[PDB]
């Protein structure tokens, strides 16, 4: 299935690269946050998985209570055939009742952008119902891969969410804070 | 199918990013090769697609007549949700009868590493015959995507190859030189 390929490629071609040294980067970042009240960043990579159509270009614009703060130190990759690539990860503040309630490394899972594009291009043969079915299966498959994987290690957390078509009351910051608070 | 997901994700998540400015990077690189005898780099990204099992960790070690020379100038990416990533591409010399016969940007298609890993991990449910079938379909599917794609533009060339199980006479440098010479 499409989802099975996307889940394995995202693990092999991203998570496996980025997770092993994530903790050390976070540790380095948190040297500037010895005052806990200034908001040290939490330890995990939180991966957002909106099942519904589209993924926002700008994560912080998804929710007024999620605000971009800055970046972790960069990760240089020189293995698995790739030469000198540099990856970045972003740190966001989560607000609740006007005050910072959490700080974390957040990002959308990129293969959802591929599922979205396939649904737009008719040569992909991919209906909207197919897109949703594969998005769901991508999430399940990736969950299962990570349960086994050596590189996590309490390193990564998937946050999948789907909103009712007729309501816009879902709060992404609240959803992430739920995961943070445990 | 697995291949369909891999082909679309490699287009959306790599080729679409790297191809639009490739020409300009090559032009910049070739400022140091105004003497053609020193070997200016050819214009396309040549993507190697070995269908057989495994992809070499080190492209230049695949063939004594392919030698790594150096890198293009880097490509900074800050769009499609990714913040400040830096990509690189490698320039190789191709030799024939002891002398340089071509110079090009070469790399293996990364989703083949994913197909290889899926064949190694039993939770993937993926036999060796499945792996080959999907590798072939990945190549066909990607070919078809690129035929349409706006970002190439005589920018990219796929070089797929499969060797007989009982013979080791295939020369990768000769195969690439064939494509270069047209
Ligand atoms: C911008 C973009 C869009 C889609 C993918 C993708 O499907 C995809 C699937 C597997 C692995 C990757 C690599 C990554 O997320 O760095 C992928 O990257 C994508 C990227 C970077
Ligand atoms: C090291 C490695 C391994 C596998 C993939 C991959 O399957 C894959 C599939 C689609 C898109 C990408 C992104 C890329 O090649 O930069 C992919 O990247 C991979 C990388 C970088």
Curated annotation (Swiss-Prot), chains A, B:
Result of changing residue 87 to A:
Abolished cGAMP-binding
Instruction: Describe the effect of residue 114 to A.
Output: Strong decrease in c-di-GMP-binding
**Which residues are reported to carry the modification Phosphothreonine?**
76
Looking at the record, which segments are called Cyclic dinucleotide-binding domain (CBD)?
2-182
Question: What, per the annotation, is the impact of changing residue 87 to S?
Answer: Strong decrease in c-di-GMP-binding
Describe tissue expression: Ubiquitously expressed. Expressed in skin endothelial cells, alveolar type 2 pneumocytes, bronchial epithelium and alveolar macrophages.
Quote the subcellular location field of this record.
Endoplasmic reticulum membrane; Cytoplasm, Perinuclear region; Endoplasmic reticulum-Golgi intermediate compartment membrane; Golgi apparatus membrane
Per the record, what is the consequence of mutating residue 89 to A? Strong decrease in c-di-GMP and cGAMP-binding
Effect of substituting residue 124 to Q: Abolished translocation from the endoplasmic reticulum in response to cGAMP-binding. Reduced phosphorylation by TBK1
**Where along the chain is 2',3'-cUAMP bound?**
14, 85, 110
Record annotation: effect of changing residue 5 to S/V: Partially constitutively active mutant that promotes the production of type I interferon in absence of cGAMP ligand
Altering residue 120 to A: what's the impact?
A: Abolished translocation from the endoplasmic reticulum in response to cGAMP-binding. Reduced phosphorylation by TBK1
Query: What's an example GO BP annotation here?
Result: positive regulation of type I interferon-mediated signaling pathway
List the ranges whose topology is Cytoplasmic.
Answer: 2-182
* Residues modified as Phosphoserine: 88
Disorder association: STING-associated vasculopathy, infantile-onset: An autoinflammatory disease characterized by early-onset systemic inflammation and cutaneous vasculopathy, resulting in severe skin lesions. Violaceous, scaling lesions of fingers, toes, nose, cheeks and ears progress to acral necrosis in most of the patients. Some patients have severe interstitial lung disease.
Provide the domain comment.
Answer: In absence of cGAMP, the transmembrane and cytoplasmic regions interact to form an integrated, domain-swapped dimeric assembly. In absence of cyclic nucleotide (c-di-GMP or cGAMP), the protein is autoinhibited by an intramolecular interaction between the cyclic dinucleotide-binding domain (CBD) and the C-terminal tail (CTT). Following cGAMP-binding, the cyclic dinucleotide-binding domain (CBD) is closed, leading to a 180 degrees rotation of the CBD domain relative to the transmembrane domain. The pLxIS motif constitutes an IRF3-binding motif: following phosphorylation by TBK1, the phosphorylated pLxIS motif of STING1 recruits IRF3. IRF3 is then phosphorylated and activated by TBK1 to induce type-I interferons and other cytokines.
Assigned protein family: Belongs to the STING family.
Its quaternary organisation is:
Homotetramer; in presence of cyclic nucleotide (c-di-GMP or cGAMP), forms tetramers and higher-order oligomers through side-by-side packing. Interacts (when phosphorylated) with IRF3; following activation and phosphorylation on the pLxIS motif by TBK1, recruits IRF3. Interacts with RIGI, MAVS and SSR2. Interacts with RNF5 and TRIM56. Interacts with TBK1; when homodimer, leading to subsequent production of IFN-beta. (Microbial infection) Interacts with human papillomavirus (HPV) protein E7.
What protein name applies here? Stimulator of interferon genes protein
Record organism: Homo sapiens (Human)
